[model samples]
Structures are given as C-alpha cells and as structure tokens.
Target chain A: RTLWLRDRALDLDRVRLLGVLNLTPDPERALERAREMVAEGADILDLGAESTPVEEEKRRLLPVLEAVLSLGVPVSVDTRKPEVAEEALKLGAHLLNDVTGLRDERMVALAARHGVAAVVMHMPAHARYRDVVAEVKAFLEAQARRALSAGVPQVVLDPGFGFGKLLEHNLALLRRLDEIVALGHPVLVGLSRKRTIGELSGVEDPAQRVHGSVAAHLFAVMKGVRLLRVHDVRAHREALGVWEALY
Target chain B: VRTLWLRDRALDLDRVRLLGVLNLTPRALERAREMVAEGADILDLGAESEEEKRRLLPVLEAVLSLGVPVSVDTRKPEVAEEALKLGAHLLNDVTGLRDERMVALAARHGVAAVVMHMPVPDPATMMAHARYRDVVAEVKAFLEAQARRALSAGVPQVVLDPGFGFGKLLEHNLALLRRLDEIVALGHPVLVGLSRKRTIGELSGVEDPAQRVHGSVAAHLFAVMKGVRLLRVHDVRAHREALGVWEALYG
Candidate 1:
C-alpha cells in the first residue's frame, strides 16, 4: 500500500473520490460544495484556477490556491506553469496537477525543489495514436523518468481523455486504462462531465451526464484506477458504495 | 388460417420476456427488423384504427414471414380474427374482449390471449370513480374473473395485466405494482407495461418519455425481481442490455 497525501494509503481495491474546485469568478459554489463533498466521503480536493483548456496561461493561480488550501484536506493545485506551482506550494497545496505531461522543464524542477506529489497527464498535439493506452503509457513513462531524474518522490499518471482525442480514442483509452496503470504509478482519472460521456450516454447536456459519468467512474475503479476526479461527489460516493457492496 | 405449435416450449415465465412495441404506421417493417436483430423475442404490433389496421396487415404479414412470434394489438374483432387467420401467435386485446367473438377467435385459433384490465369506456371518467376498497384484492379478483372467462371460452393460455396508468392515479399504480405478487399468485403469467409510464416520469421528474428508458429499465427490473413475468417496452435493445447486466449481477 503506497502512501498518498493526507497520510492515507492507496488501496487499489477501494475506489477514492477526488472533488473538483474550479476557482473561477463563479467558482462552482466551491466553499460550501467542498464541505458537502468531504462529508460525502471525498478523499482529495483538486482545486483549479482555470478549466485546464490548452489556451489558458495558468495565470492568477495564487488566489484560488489560497482559497482552497485551508480546507484541512490534501489540496491539489491544477496548474501546468512552474511559477504558479511555486506560489501554490507557498500557500500549502500538497499536489501539483500538471496537465501538460511535465513538458515544461521548470515544472519538474519546481516539483523536485518543493518535494510534493504530482500528476503528469498525457495530451498529444494532433491526437495521433494507433493505440491510445500504449501512447499514453509511453508519454507518462517519459515524464516519470524526467521527474525521477529531477528528484521528485511521488508521481501519478493521467491518460487525458477528451483533451485531444475524438470519441473513439476516448472510449479506447477508457476500455484500456489498466495498461496505463500497469506502469507502476498511481493512476488518476478525471472523466467527470467530459464530452465522451455525452457521446456514450446520448446526453448532450453536462448536468444530465451524472449517471453516465458515475458509470464511467465505476468502470475505472473496477479496472484499478487509484483516483477519480468528479463534480458529483455524493452521487459517485453512493454509487461506488453500492458497487463495493455488490461486487 | 395457419396453425403454429407453441404448447410446451418450456417458456420460463419467471424470467421477464421483452415484448417490443411496433407501430406499423411509422415504417414498421424496418423498425421491427432492426428490433428483432437487436434481440427482441416478441413483437406487439399496434393496429389501432381502420387505417392502422390496413397499414399493419402488410407489416404483420412481412414480420410473421420472418419466422418470429407476433402479437396483434387490436380491440376490433374482425381485425383480430383476420390477424389470427394470417398466423399471429397472440391476441393482445386492450378492450378486454367486450365483444363475444374475441374469445371465440382466440379459442378457434388456439393461441394465447393477453387480457388487460382497463376501466370501462373513458379512462379518465373511470379513474374519477375508481375507488378500490382494496386495490390488490380488487385487481386480483377482476383478473381472476377475466381468466375464468377466457378459460371458459377455450383459450389455451392467458396472461393478466393490472394496467398501469390506465384508470388509476400514481398512488394506485404504485400500490398495485408494489403488490404484484398477489396478482401473480393467481396461477397465470403476468405482463407488466411500465415502460415510460406516468408513474416513472413522476418519480424521476423526466419530462421526455424517450429519456425515461433507464428509469423504466430500473422499474422493470424491480418488477421482474418481484416475480412479474413479462415486460412490454418500446426500446427492446436497451431493456435487453439492462436485463443482461442485471442478471449477471444478481442471478
């Protein structure tokens, strides 16, 4: 059992919920929602300054980091820039969620200097992949080697679904996520409210995608993914509790 | 009239059969073929009006020609008689055989008859006066009487249905559905039509009927677990997939 942040050991059999706190102007009602999510059995709180779209420059991340750091849980700063990573570390964020596969060399230096847990996600430039899981594993393995060389202690890998791939690529990655997890790093899946769920469930609206999103989470958990990033924490908690009891 | 031998197929009535509803007015042949390819066992073709009856005959002929069991959904005795003569396996009469010829047609053809208990005349007026001193008892008693009537008229097999959303309120439907065992205990196979019904819409707050397939599947599985025999649905493949996963988990 590898130890995670907040003194919790990672159990591959038990599914863990990571609540999302997007600290934009309207911030998705996070202060109150975070309390409710924690009460509903969330294991981690992933706080982001922006929506993780490729065009955002990761600016002004310190205020959002300051807002979610004192929530008395393991806080993950969802940023890709190294300067924002340092500022977030100063404000007590314990995890660095870099969506850009440790591509910035300074980000690896920041993680090594700060000695915090970090998640490296896979996003291709043109969505070119013969096998999505193999491609993702290769990308994450390269990032892990870079992180290890830079002296970072903990590394988690994310197969970034829906970032650059189409619907078929997303489904392929979801069905084959176990191959990515076989690389011996903790696997974190953020499939909540993705467009792939809309395509799978025939639900175009994001609010109506809870059932499908929860089903996707259950699939990932059954395949031994370590962390599930979700917006509907209580629903996912209830669903996983039922799934655990049944299976 | 063609005779088909369906007596002792050893059909497991405990396992719910997905009866897909096929309306002939809307490209029925193509939909029926697609549904059959997607794992539909029985097709319930609705031949409601005279125009529908005219349109459904070719669809029924075409579908029955495909070597699958077909049930003609009509209250008209003449249409039911003709459909039976053309080799429809079952007669699903929604009017509950008001005319005497319906029982005779089902008996002469030696096929099954599904008798649904609907209120007399208008469903709304019947619902207004629908006072069940004990709903389960009343429903069981009425179905028993109908079964007796069908037996006396020499029908080979009979399926009873306590019609949901026909002449009852939401609570009435729920009470009857919750206590479906009392009706199933009458020694007849039960067919439940809870697909996209008003009760499910009320429970799930889903305004669109098409979007209620998951809730409908959940309710159908609930009924199946409670010993109900057959499920009538619009989307055959979805119900089939849901039931496969359900049986994989529970059974």
Candidate 2:
C-alpha cells in the first residue's frame, strides 16, 4: 500500500515511523523538536494542538505545521476540529489525523478537498467492549470506508490504543491487529508512552517506556502494521533497523 | 510443552525464561540478589577462569540459598562436580558439553545441561574456527547430535545454545539467529546469549558493553519471537520489562 502525500508518495513496503510533536503549551520547542525528529529518522511528523477555541488551536498549531511542512517529510495534522483542520490543510498538511474517526463530515470533506490522506482513528467515549478486536475492527473498517467513499484520497486506520480501551482491550486489538490490517487499508498504531505500555512495563514515567513501546510496535510490524506513531524516534529507528535486517 | 528437570524441581518450558548472568569472577555476591530482584528466572553464575573452585563456589552457595534455580557456567569437570555437590541445579557448559565427564556429571547429578555451539572448546581461540560452509546447518547438526547424545546418555534435560560469538563472526551469528527455529526444531529449550556481545555492539553501533542494552533487548526480543525459550542476558530488568509487554501481547 502507498500513502499519497502533498508532493511525494510513501510506499508502505516496510514499517515507517511517525514522530509525535504536541504543540500544546510548548510551541516554542515544537519546530526544534520537529527538526530533531527528522534527523532521528522520522518518516513523517504528526503535529497536534488538540485543544481550546478554534483560533487558539490554530494559534498553537498552524505556524509549527507550516514550518514542519517544509522539512521535506510528510506532516500530519492531528486535530479533531474542522476549522483547525481546514486551516492546516490549506497550508499543505499531507495527512489529516482526526482522533474522532473523522465522524464529522466537515473534517472528512476538508481532507477530501485538500487531496490528502485521512488517518481514521477509533476513539470511543467509554472503555467498554464485548470482543474488542471485533468492535474495533468494525469501527475502523466502517470509518475508513466512510472517509474513502467521501473522496478522502487515502485512508489509514488506527485502533486508537489507550484512548478508551483498557489494558485487556488494547491487548486484544494488538494481538489481532492483522484483522484491522486485513481491512485493506494501511494500519497505523500509537501505543507510544501510553498507559498500556506503562501498565505493562511498570515504568511510571511515560518517557522511560521506550523499550516496551518498541517491543509492542515491533509486534505490530510483525503483524503487518505499516506505520507507527511514536514519541521516541531514535529508539524506534534503531530497533527497526535491527528488526528489519533480521526479518 | 516440555518440562526441564532441575535436580529437585521441574520448570515447564512454556514461556521465555530470563537467565541473568552472574560472573563470580566479576561478582562476589550482591549481583545475585540484585538479579533476582530484577526478575531473573534463573541465575547463571560463571567464574570464567580456571581458579573456578576459589572464584565460583562461595558465590554459587550463596545464590543457591536465594531459592531460585542456579546454573553453573563452567567448562571444567571438577568445578561442575563441586557446584553439583553444592546443589547447583543446572550446568551451562559453554564448550558444548564435548567432555563426556561433563555429560556423565550432569547425568549423575540428574540435572539439566546447556549445550552451546562453539567451533573449539576454548573461548579465547574458538573464533579461529569460525569458518563453516553453512554456519546454520553446521551449528544445527552439532546441537542436534549433542542434544541427542546428552539425552541418550541419561541426561534428563538439554538446553541448546548456538554459542553466538563463541567461534562465529557477525554474519555467522546473524544466520544462526535468523534461522534459529531449525535449532529449536531439535525439540529442546533453546538458550541464546546476545546480551552485550560484540555482534550487538556491531548491530547497534554502540561501542560500550553496558550501553548495548537497547540493541541487546531488540536482538533478544527477536530471539524470543523465534521460539527461543531461554535468554541469557546482562540487563534482566530491561528484558523483563520488554518481555512483559511482548508476552502479554504476543506470548
């Protein structure tokens, strides 16, 4: 599978890394962090503001997104608001990462109008499920179909680990993530420094969960996940380097 | 699913077991307690020198008191005999158990043995015989033959190690690991020690041994995924943490 970006295309032949740059409360360090991520072997930069009034969200995200867009790597705008999504898209965001599964029509339309791929993520309000894999697979497949049918050029599916799922639910989804990948859309996973990893690794600090996070992501890649949304870029890149060489 | 008889007990080989390295030549005692605290399933205490009795016995006795299974990593028959007398539960013969007395000692003690692959019996010179037509096939054949030999000779349980870096180069080690299942196919619990080895340094580009934890974990995680049952490592906490997530999701 290939992800069509603004100027170039990314072939999902092997696992790719998406570095996370949260622009909330610390937009000053955002551009420097983005440059560091690119230098650390990040294939794409996932920039998010994830807050406040629409203008405030744009106030925090747009300039950094615009600056990151010129770093020669594809930039993904992780926002749920339509106004913020549209402004970021207009500034040439390569991917729209809507945490709400693109449930809002305006968000889906903005992605379609900009001709960028939409990362259809599953974020249920409650961490309850009967057969979590089946439910998540269904939701991700349905939303991906919704975005693709609405003319979003490409669709990527994320099971949204830790976003309403308990440890058991996350495990079920990760164990059977191939089912989500079997939906025929490129699968992306974001288990980086989440509560699930902390609960598993027992590392209280999220930043120290790099080893556990890399292990989970490697398992994802083994099950055919194409992209990983992560916070520690160098660790994942070094691990993936050795992992790919062996496999 | 097989159970390895460890002298007085049995360990079901159902999940990956972490074996913490306790170099008594390097350690006097506290490392053993630290390793147990760090989640070491089995502590591997090695003297690494010929003064095995002096360097190994006191610490071995202390670690055995910790109530976890301890494997004495030695190539000498007398040291193996002394350790078995002191109630060591397993033998880690890094020379691939070539000495029949070692096999006899294990069979006599009714304890398990680890049969590692190396071209020569000496670690200092094994790298000279690192040449092979097919490293994987050759190592596989040696392990299969030795494993069968040990088991037929009345050794109750046998753990196989491909002896990464014992007598092999980088490519040889990689080949053994890439197709390690062929060795695991011999139907014994396969043990791998890639922790802080030169290959890990080469693969991870980290020069210092202690700093190779990340690369070591990555390589060992690969080994675990390939059905290797035992991992001999330096960083037990890191492996335990990584395996905690890995086993929960993929075990």
Top candidate (lDDT): 2
Residue A183's lDDT in candidate 1: 86
Candidate 2 clashes between residue pairs 3 or more apart in a chain or in different chains? none
Q: How accurately is candidate 2 docked according to DockQ? A: 0.63
Model 2 reaches an interface RMSD of: 1.2
* Candidate 1 local lDDT, B4-75, one digit each (tens): 223323355444576789865544678888888866778889867367567778778888877778888888
For B1-251, candidate 2 gives per-residue lDDT tens digits of 67766899988767778889987664345788888998888989898755779888988887788899999999899999999999999999988889999999999999999999888887788878989999998988888889899999999889999998888989998998899888888888889999889987787677888888878888888998888878999989888889889988885
Q: What is the C-alpha DockQ of each candidate?
A: 0.05, 0.63
User: Which residue pairs of candidate 1 clash?
Assistant: none
Please state the CAPRI-style docking class of candidate 2.
medium
The TM-scores, chain A only, for the candidates as listed are 0.90, 0.96
Error of 2 at A119 (Å): 0.4
Give all candidates' CA lDDT scores: 0.74, 0.87
